Design a protein around this ligand. Structure first.
Ligand code: MG
Ligand code: ZN
Lengths: 130, 110, 530, 171, 1090
């Protein structure tokens, strides 16, 4: 199509950030030092992000181009193009809610001008000193 | 816009005052030689102090005369023969040789 | 084996770690202090992730360097917005060194065949599969990859009116990019047109250019109509013709058109005995009289012209009813001016003048405002070809004999010593100070420079190549001629102040080590400024 | 000379045991040779010299219907340690050709291409005499100097040129 | 003249050379011999000046030692830096790809005070890199060179800056040290230590220990001095000491005992505050205190500090006369940081010494702690000392440092001029952006020390200077120039090396001075240099010094530009630079017009092979020469043949001598790449014509005859290196082997049993060089695009072999590929006068314009590119070139012609191909050239080609006619530059794309596309070629669906599909989505999806 007249912005709500995301990363691991493969439910994870090689699952059961739009029961990776690894956004569920630094440490503070308080006091609230 | 931009931008290489004056005028900053303009139209009278120029402009309309005190002796008066006591100066024209502050010209002459 | 990992990974790791630990502390049922501390750590981790080195100290990994945040992708000169969006690498594009291509028409440019072949590889492959040269695409790809003899018959059939955008960095002005018809050339250089060199500000002193192949029909069109060099002769500055003759062409046409007394085949107008002699039935006759040793191109001859339109005053006095598609009228001109007007368009009137770069400027301006752009494009190309042809047989060549010195340079200089030394005789007594002396010296030696600057032109003959080059307006100034022959005069210090002892010697004579060493300042200063 | 093949060295950019000049400079000197052949087909000459002395162009042993026209010319200087065995391939052409690559043709790693100059003429010039004044039908007499390498005589060359021009003027 | 066995080059030298051209690698070798503490230096230090020599290492150890623990029970002092036998010879390091280094010992005595027993041992510091006689360091088998750094000398620099408010001259001094805190005194604010603003001078003056009376007595007739002690709030010593001590460091308990120790530790102490010998010297000589005293003195304790303030108040007051309490009288005047009296040159030795210092200081920590941790008595300096920090500090100095550059080996002269290079920039030096327009500019002190002409044309103009010919380095590091003294108008032959300081104290006349045979100013008034840069013209009585010979001020590179003084500094600079770009040519040939410096440059450059010992040549081979000495020994000089130089050029050395020649001590045996009979021969003598010719030579292009592509006169050998390593991975292990799974026989026919291409097999852009297999996948080394030709040698290093590989490698292989570059079109040529240009057209020799004898001219340069550019050097060089090529005889007369009155003897007659020397500033002249062109006619025919004006009647080969006016033909020596089409030409329809950035990976080597920048986009927008820009910044770069579809669409011959959205947008979108900025796409009616 390549036809969008205007471009609107805003603030990413947890709902919209969840709606964006395809899977939830829930382990602090990138790639295995031995084999150099992506780690399951970690960063670079094929299940949540996308497949390493073009039309190839993690475990290595479905590696054919013929089929598309199916999730492998063993690993849970979807067999599509690799380019999605530079598209399919992820997310992290914070056990405790965390504010954005841009609406806080900005000069003047947007949260600070919204809720009407000193930035030095707002610092103490966010950084658990009050 | 871009035609004009590039047209103005290109022959900066073929200059030597020069590109400083161009970028100073385009960036709309206060000049290196702050030569004031006439705030009101009237007749000029210049008193020569201890190595200083006291210019007073007596107005034609009927208000307060424009007075200046502390400007350097090596700024030089505008050639309009040359500016001395017993002359009538316009609100538009520059007073001394150098560069007229744009902000000053805008607020006075629109 | 070694990893060149991005910093984001470490921040995301730090966040997910502290998130997992916090979730484990929530699962455990821990006290408030450790949970609030872990929440502070998490808060600081996400804060650092979104903006590193904003609140207090930045996060660092190997060797005390701050981690590239998510916002650090966007901010800076190496930002996404700035670096990785405004200037990119491009496919279907080449770069090479430019050479002159004076055989080429303005709209044409010469492309190195070994470049061209690769630059149009798919386009030539398409036509190679269209023809029964290649059986399938892969064999065409292989054929063009191998550079087989059959490709060359096709590559012109493929390149036929498929223009290319030539660029010369830095791309200052709009014409700094121009579209051209790529003519194949054997070599590894881009044969640029001589006129467009000013439109690129491109010398042939190693300066590279970048070819781009516009692929889309729309692009091909845009190239052809908007920015094809022929279509935009006039600069987008003063609306003056930028693609006009400069350097050689100028001296070529200057020599071609300029008039000379006491020449070969000259107009005499003899009394009693002989006829007028310097009178010729046709420009053809005059050309035959020139090529055979009998007529000199720069002779005030009386030629009878048919194809050319006369001067505005001579239009009225002769015809003033019918036109001259094939009539006849007499002109007291130079063969060269007729060979010049032969280049200028049919319905354009006669000039009968020496073709100074300004005269060329106003002529090509008149052509630009009066005639279509194609007429200008072509006429200025004929002016280029003719100009260059006549640049050779101009006889513009430099020699130690050709570069002269003014014979009064001894008299006028030494006199200007007698005024200077005198000041010293005034100083030693104690009247004038060093600073006023230092200025009066500058005045005196500037006057001395001026005297030589004038005196040079009074002595130097007209045909003198040095005088040709400058007084044509081709290139160079009377300043450069004065600092080449006579003396450089006063040269400036690196502060801006002038040195009171000048260069009292021509570059022809050669400077003394000191006079040179003083000259170095202003030149290095100039190089540092440019 | 179109391609030379020294049995020892495997490429241009090395040296032979016990020679003064390097293989590049030997090739560069063998370009300086002047030879003439009857058969236009590629003919292989042989130059074999073992032990000390100055290898000249006269020491080359050409086959039947090939002649060297500068025996005096210095190629390489040897010692008792060094042995120079070089075969020089000659072919009849015209003008100049670039050093044709053996990778393109069906030629082995041993064969070294050399920048062939199929130009048996060395120099040509001319001046024209005005001879007689403008009155009584003036004519121009041209005198041309033709200077060959000794591959062929000026006569042969000028005749070949004249022949080429006569062939080249079609009507 | 002076050179033992050089080919006779007739000279246009009017004066006699007083001083011979000294060692052109002295500023490298001598400095490094001063660092090492070598015998040749030691003797020179014993002879010249002070009678107590100390080597760089001896000094840097002497200053450091003794190392001692906090208690002061055990200590450790070093001495005697002995240099034992070197690991291997220079060639073997370049062969084995190791470093050329000497094992370095130091005698170390572990002293124990409590017991009274000293344990002595020889400590092996490591394989310390040593210098070659060529003046280079071979690091990891690469000839690197340490460029000498220009800096502001340690000392006290007074300045005066104008105020915007008050408009008064405040006199601000800066006390720059070797290492420590930087003191500076102002007036209107006092002292400022490490940006400690507002600290009146009286507080430290008191705090050190001056009573308020002694300040009033010492200051004398000062106003601001009496103002500063009046303005001081903290009156008394301890009050002022506690006042300054708290202000110096915040958050520390301010005690007297700590303050009084810190005050005298920060300045007066030797260990904490690193005093400089050059500093002590400078402050002693300039302030005038400790006059006629020994060197290696202490720092500025008190006397210097009060003397500098005494100087400052006298400067601020404004009196030229001064008398110091204790010191001698000295004139008072401001100092300039650019002026060479203050601008010192720290050189290889000192730059290595400064890193040895830091290394041994990084060791001193480890030793100092190791002594406190380890038990007493049962410890030896073997175990205590760690060698790693020092060898690491040196390997760091030869591992990315701006003062340790690659040798530019484009030619000998490029290397030679890469040595004796004065760098303003680098660590412990001013930055490229920080450097102003004033410091870049030349200074009247530069004259005869740094070259005013030679400097790059890029952004480093003025900064990267080059040391002048006769200049040398003083032991301090001050650049000294030689002069001849003159006494009451009678010139002496006493060659004296003066520094930029004492220079300015004296009166120096220029070398072009009329002399009375022996030495006496025959001219009544001489042209002279006065105090500073006043090019005066004064009486002979007043003058005390004079320039030895002319071209003092010129660099070795710039000194090979014949008729330099007829050029401008710009084109001179351009030519001087171009000569350092000149490529080496297959045959190579010397200029028919050069300068005397070309004979000397080639031999000292070090690529030429010289005879150390006088003798007869026993036998000559292409590989090596063996000479039998008069001493009786046999020297076997090894030559290197088609060895790769740093900048991809040939290091091919030719033996010039025959198998029974006679060689004297210091005579050339074998030429290096750019040498013909032991003189610097970069380019070639081409028959130049000077006329504009049918467009091809327009806007400085150049046209040359196919003759050059035929004869291979300008042909170059270019050698490129291609490396690959069998590095270990976690899956398996890499191996260099012939067998590849996915190939044909044709692509592996050139390979051998090893699995690498055989020596001499011609390679094409794409062909396999090294067959390598990754655990199985093919990761073979392929020759890059725009590169082809023969393979010289394959240098292999295996795990099986004993050679040193880098950590995590099984088998390194390094392939040398040679290509024989013919001078094609677009390749850049240039004279020695800046007259550069690309090769326009290669005219088939016939059509090129020719001389009436038949000789067709080799190049044509455009006339129009002479007057505007202001370089008529090329024309004089062309003319004297013609005079040189064709033999000549100045038909003398009964008693000489008038034009040759000031002409050299034994240069009336000369034969064909007669090489000529013209001293760059005192060579051939206009009236000499004019008459000289009046030559004989040696063209085998008996007619002259040129005329008395040097303008030949050329014949047009194109048309056939003779040109209507006579053309300036002659023989200009022209150089092939390194700017070649084979490097610069790029092309890309489609190929491999980069992984991280989804645009074509940029590069000539990587088969890359060109950068379509912002300024290119502005021009495209200014046209309004929307679809063009929207193609270039989408399917022709970023768009992954576009880049694959466009190729298919073009090759099928369909419409180009509409460019969708670039990856450069998607990445920004996803980046802003990752920054939690909810960006969404929607039109007037209906919202879009990503
Ligand atoms: Mg340029
Ligand atoms: Zn799977």
């Amino acid at each position: 199509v390549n036809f969008f007249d205007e471009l609107r912005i805003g603030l990413a709500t947890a709902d919209d950030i969840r709606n964006w995301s395809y899977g939830e990363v829930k382990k602090p691991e990138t790639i295995n030092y031995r084999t150099l493969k992506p780690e399951k439910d970690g960063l670079f994870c094929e299940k949540i992000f996308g497949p390493t090689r073009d039309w190839e699952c993690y475990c290595g059961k479905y590696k054919r181009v013929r089929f598309k739009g199916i999730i492998c029961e063993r690993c849970g990776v979807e067999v599509t193009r690799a380019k999605v690894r530079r598209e399919r956004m992820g997310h992290i569920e914070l056990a405790a809610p965390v504010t954005h630094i841009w609406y806080f440490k900005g000069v003047p503070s947007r949260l600070g001008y919204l809720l009407d308080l000193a930035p030095k006091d707002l610092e103490k609230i966010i950084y658990f000193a009050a | 816009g871009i035609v004009a931009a590039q047209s103005i931008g290109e022959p900066g290489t073929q200059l030597t005052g020069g590109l400083p004056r161009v970028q100073e005028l385009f960036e709309a900053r206060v000049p290196r030689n702050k030569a004031p303009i006439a705030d009101v139209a009237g007749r000029v009278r210049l008193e020569e102090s201890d190595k200083f120029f006291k210019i007073t402009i007596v107005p034609d309309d009927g208000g307060e005369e424009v007075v200046y005190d502390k400007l350097s002796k090596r700024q030089r008066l505008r050639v309009i023969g040359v500016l001395s006591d017993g002359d009538h100066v316009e609100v538009g024209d520059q007073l001394m040789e150098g560069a007229a502050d744009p902000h000053e010209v805008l607020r006075v002459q629109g | 084996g070694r990893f060149a990992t991005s910093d984001l990974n470490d921040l995301y790791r730090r966040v997910i770690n502290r998130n997992n630990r916090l979730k484990r502390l929530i699962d455990l049922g821990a006290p408030e202090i450790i949970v609030n501390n872990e929440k502070r750590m998490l808060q600081e981790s996400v804060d650092a992730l979104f903006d590193n080195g904003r609140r207090g100290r930045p996060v660092t990994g190997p060797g005390n360097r701050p981690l590239k945040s998510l916002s650090d992708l966007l901010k800076g000169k190496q930002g996404r917005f700035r670096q990785n969006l405004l200037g990119k690498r491009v496919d279907y594009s080449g770069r090479s060194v430019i050479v002159v291509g004076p055989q080429l028409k303005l709209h044409q440019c010469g492309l190195p065949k070994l470049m061209a072949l690769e630059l149009f590889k798919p386009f030539v492959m398409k036509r190679l599969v269209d023809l029964n040269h290649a059986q399938n695409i892969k064999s065409a790809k292989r054929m063009v990859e191998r550079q087989r003899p059959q490709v060359w018959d096709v590559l012109e059939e493929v390149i036929a009116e498929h223009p290319v955008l030539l660029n010369r960095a830095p791309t200052l002005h709009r014409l700094g990019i121009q579209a051209f018809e790529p003519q194949l050339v054997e070599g590894k250089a881009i044969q640029l047109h001589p006129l467009v060199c000013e439109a690129f500000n491109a010398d042939f002193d190693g300066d590279q250019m970048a070819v781009h192949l516009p692929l889309s029909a729309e692009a091909q069109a845009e190239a052809r109509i908007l920015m094809l060099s022929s279509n935009n002769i006039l600069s987008p500055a003063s609306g003056k013709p930028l693609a006009m003759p400069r350097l050689d062409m100028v001296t070529g046409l200057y020599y071609l058109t300029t008039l000379v007394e006491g020449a070969t085949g000259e107009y005499q107008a003899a009394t009693k005995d002989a006829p007028e002699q310097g009178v010729y039935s046709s420009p053809a006759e005059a050309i035959m009289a020139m090529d055979r040793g009998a007529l000199s191109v720069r002779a005030k001859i009386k030629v009878r012209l048919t194809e050319l339109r006369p001067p505005t005053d001579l239009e009225a006095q002769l015809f003033e009813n019918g036109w001259k598609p094939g009539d006849a009228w007499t002109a007291e001109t130079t063969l060269g001016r007729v060979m010049f007007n032969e280049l200028l368009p049919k319905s354009y009137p006669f000039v009968n003048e020496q073709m100074h770069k300004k005269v060329q400027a106003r002529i090509i301006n008149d052509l630009a405002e009066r005639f279509p752009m194609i007429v200008v494009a072509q006429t200025v190309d004929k002016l280029k070809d003719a100009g260059f042809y006549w640049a050779t047989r101009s006889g513009v060549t430099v020699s130690m004999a050709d570069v002269l010195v003014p014979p009064q340079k001894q008299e006028i200089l030494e006199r200007h010593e007698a005024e200077a030394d005198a000041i010293e005789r005034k100083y030693q007594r104690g009247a004038l100070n060093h600073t006023e002396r230092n200025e009066s010296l500058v005045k005196i030696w500037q006057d001395a420079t001026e005297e030589v600057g004038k005196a040079l032109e009074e002595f130097y003959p007209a045909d003198n190549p040095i005088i040709t080059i400058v007084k044509s307006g081709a290139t160079g100034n009377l300043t450069q001629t004065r600092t080449l022959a006579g003396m450089k005069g006063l040269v400036t210090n690196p502060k801006g102040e002038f040195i009171p002892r000048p260069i009292k010697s021509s570059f022809r004579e050669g400077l003394t080590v000191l006079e040179y060493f003083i000259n170095t300042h202003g030149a290095r200063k100039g190089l540092a400024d440019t | 000379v179109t391609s030379i093949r020294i049995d020892g060295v495997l490429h241009e950019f090395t040296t032979v045991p016990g020679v003064k000049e390097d293989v590049t400079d030997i090739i560069l000197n063998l370009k300086g040779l002047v030879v003439s052949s009857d058969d236009d087909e590629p003919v292989t000459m042989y130059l074999r010299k073992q032990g000390p002395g100055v290898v000249t162009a006269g020491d080359i042993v050409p086959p039947a219907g090939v002649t060297v026209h500068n025996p005096d010319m210095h190629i390489a200087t040897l010692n008792d340690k060094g042995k120079l065995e070089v075969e020089l391939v000659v072919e009849r052409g015209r003008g100049y050709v670039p050093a044709v690559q053996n990778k393109a043709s069906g030629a082995e790693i041993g064969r070294i291409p050399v920048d062939s100059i199929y130009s048996p003429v060395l120099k040509v010039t001319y001046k024209v005499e005005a001879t007689r004044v403008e009155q009584r039908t003036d004519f121009d007499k041209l005198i041309i100097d033709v200077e060959t390498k000794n591959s062929i005589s000026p006569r042969d060359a000028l005749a070949s040129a004249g022949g080429t021009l006569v062939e080249l003027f079609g009507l | 003249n002076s050179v033992p066995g050089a080919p006779n080059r007739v000279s246009f030298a009017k004066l006699r050379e007083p001083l011979e051209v000294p060692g052109l690698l002295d500023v490298q070798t001598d400095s490094f011999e001063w660092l090492v503490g070598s015998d040749r230096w030691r003797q020179a230090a014993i002879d010249r000046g002070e009678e107590n020599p100390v080597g760089g290492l001896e000094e840097v150890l002497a200053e450091l030692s003794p190392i001692e623990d906090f208690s002061g029970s055990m200590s450790l002092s070093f001495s005697d830096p002995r240099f034992d036998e070197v690991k291997a010879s220079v060639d073997e390091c370049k062969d084995k790809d190791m470093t050329y280094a000497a094992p370095l010992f130091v005698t170390a005595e572990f002293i124990n005070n409590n017991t009274g027993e000293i344990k002595s041992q020889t400590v092996f510091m490591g394989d310390f890199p040593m210098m070659t006689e060529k003046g280079t360091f071979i690091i990891n088998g690469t000839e690197r060179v340490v460029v000498s750094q220009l800096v502001r000398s340690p000392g006290v620099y007074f300045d005066e800056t104008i105020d915007k408010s008050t408009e008064k001259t405040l006199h601000s001094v800066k006390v720059i040290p070797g290492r420590g805190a930087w003191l500076e005194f102002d007036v209107d604010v006092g002292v400022r230590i490490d940006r400690k603003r507002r600290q009146p001078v009286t507080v430290l003056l008191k705090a050190l220990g001056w009573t308020n009376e002694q300040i009033v007595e010492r200051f004398g007739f000062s106003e601001i001095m009496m103002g500063t002690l009046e303005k001081d709030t903290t009156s008394g010593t301890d009050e002022a000491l506690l006042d300054i001590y708290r202000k110096l460091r915040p958050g520390e308990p301010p005690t007297k005992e700590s303050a009084q120790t810190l005050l005298e530790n920060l300045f007066f102490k030797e260990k904490r505050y690193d005093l400089a010998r050059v500093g002590r010297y400078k402050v002693n000589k300039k302030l005038g205190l400790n006059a006629g005293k020994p060197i290696t003195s202490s720092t500025l304790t008190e006397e210097d500090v009060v003397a500098t303030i005494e100087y400052l108040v006298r400067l601020h007051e404004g009196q030229t006369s001064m008398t110091v309490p204790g010191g001698v009288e000295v004139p008072v005047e401001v100092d300039d940081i650019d002026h060479f009296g203050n601008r010192r040159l720290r050189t290889v030795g000192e730059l290595i010494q400064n890193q040895i210092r830091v290394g041994l200081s990084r060791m001193e920590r480890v030793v100092r702690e190791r002594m406190t941790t380890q038990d007493v008595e049962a410890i030896t300096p073997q175990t205590l000392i760690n060698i790693r920090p020092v060898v690491a500090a040196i390997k760091e100095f030869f591992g990315t440092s701006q003062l340790s550059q690659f040798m530019d080996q484009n030619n000998p002269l490029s290397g030679l001029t890469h040595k004796r290079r004065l760098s303003a920039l680098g660590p412990g030096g001013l930055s490229r952006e920080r450097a102003g327009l004033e410091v870049r500019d030349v200074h009247p002190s530069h004259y005869g020390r740094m070259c005013p002409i030679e400097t790059p044309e890029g952004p480093n103009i003025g900064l990267i200077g080059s040391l002048s010919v006769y200049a040398r380095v003083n032991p301090f590091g001050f650049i000294e120039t030689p002069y001849r003294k003159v006494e009451n108008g009678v010139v002496t032959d006493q060659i004296d090396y003066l520094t930029a300081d004492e220079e300015d104290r004296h009166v120096v006349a220029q070398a072009n001075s009329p002399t009375d045979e022996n030495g006496r100013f025959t001219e009544d008034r001489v042209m002279v240099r006065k105090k500073g840069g006043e090019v005066e013209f004064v009486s002979a009585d007043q003058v005390d010094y004079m320039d030895v010979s002319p071209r003092q001020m010129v660099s070795v590179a710039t000194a090979m530009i014949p008729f330099l003084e007829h050029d401008d500094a710009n084109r001179a600079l351009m030519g001087a630079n171009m000569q350092r770009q000149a490529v080496p040519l297959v045959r190579s040939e010397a200029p028919l017009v050069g300068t005397g410096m070309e004979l000397r440059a080639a031999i000292d450059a070090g690529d030429v092979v010289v005879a150390d010992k006088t003798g007869v040549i026993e036998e000559v081979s292409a590989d090596y020469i063996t000479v039998m000495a008069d001493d009786g020994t046999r020297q076997s000089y090894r030559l290197r043949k088609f060895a790769r130089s740093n900048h991809g050029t040939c290091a091919n050395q030719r033996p010039i001598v025959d198998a029974g020649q006679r060689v004297e001590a210091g005579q050339v045996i074998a030429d290096g790449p750019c040498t013909q009979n032991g003189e610097m021969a970069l380019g070639k003598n081409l028959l130049v014509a000077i006329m504009p010719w049918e467009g091809h030579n327009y806007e400085d292009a150049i046209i040359l005859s196919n003759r050059l592509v035929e004869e291979d006169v300008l042909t170059s050998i270019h050698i490129e290196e291609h490396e690959i390593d069998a590095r270990d991975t976690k899956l398996g292990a890499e191996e260099i082997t012939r067998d590849i799974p996915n190939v044909s026989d044709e692509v592996l026919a050139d390979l051998d049993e090893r699995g690498i291409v055989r020596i001499g097999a011609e390679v094409r852009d794409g062909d396999i060089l090294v067959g390598k297999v990754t655990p199985v996948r093919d990761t073979s080394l392929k020759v890059p695009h725009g590169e082809s030709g023969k393979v010289i040698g394959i240098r292999v290093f295996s795990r099986e072999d004993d050679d040193e590989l880098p950590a995590g490698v099984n088998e390194l292989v390094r392939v040398y590929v040679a290509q024989k570059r013919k001078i094609s079109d677009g390749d850049k040529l240039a004279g020695r006068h800046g007259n550069k240009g690309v090769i326009g057209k290669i005219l088939p020799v016939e059509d090129m314009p020719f001389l009436p004898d038949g000789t067709p001219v080799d190049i044509i340069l455009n006339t129009h590119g002479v007057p505007r550019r202001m370089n008529i050097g090329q024309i004089l060089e062309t003319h004297l070139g013609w005079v040189a090529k064709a033999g000549w005889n100045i038909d003398v007369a009964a008693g000489v012609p008038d034009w040759a009155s000031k002409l050299p003897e034994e240069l009336y007659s000369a034969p064909a191909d007669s090489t000529v020397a013209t001293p760059v500033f005192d060579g051939a002249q206009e009236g000499e050239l004019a008459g000289l062109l009046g030559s004989t006619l040696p063209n085998r025919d008996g007619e002259v080609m040129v005329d008395a004006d040097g303008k030949s009647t050329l014949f047009d080969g194109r048309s056939g006619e003779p040109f209507p006016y006579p053309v300036t033909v002659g023989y200009m020596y022209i150089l092939k530059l390194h700017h070649l089409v084979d490097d610069k030409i790029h092309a890309r329809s489609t190929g491999p794309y980069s992984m991280i950035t989804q645009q074509p990976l940029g590069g000539k080597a990587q088969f890359g596309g060109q950068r379509f920048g912002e300024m290119e986009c502005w021009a495209m927008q200014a046209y309004g070629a929307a679809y063009t820009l929207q193609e270039l910044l989408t399917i022709k770069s970023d768009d992954t669906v576009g880049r694959v579809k466009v190729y298919e669409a073009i090759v099928k011959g369909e419409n180009i599909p509409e460019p969708g959205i670039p990856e450069s947008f998607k990445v920004l979108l996803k980046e802003l989505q990752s920054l939690c900025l909810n960006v969404e796409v929607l039109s007037s009616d209906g919202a879009a999806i990503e």
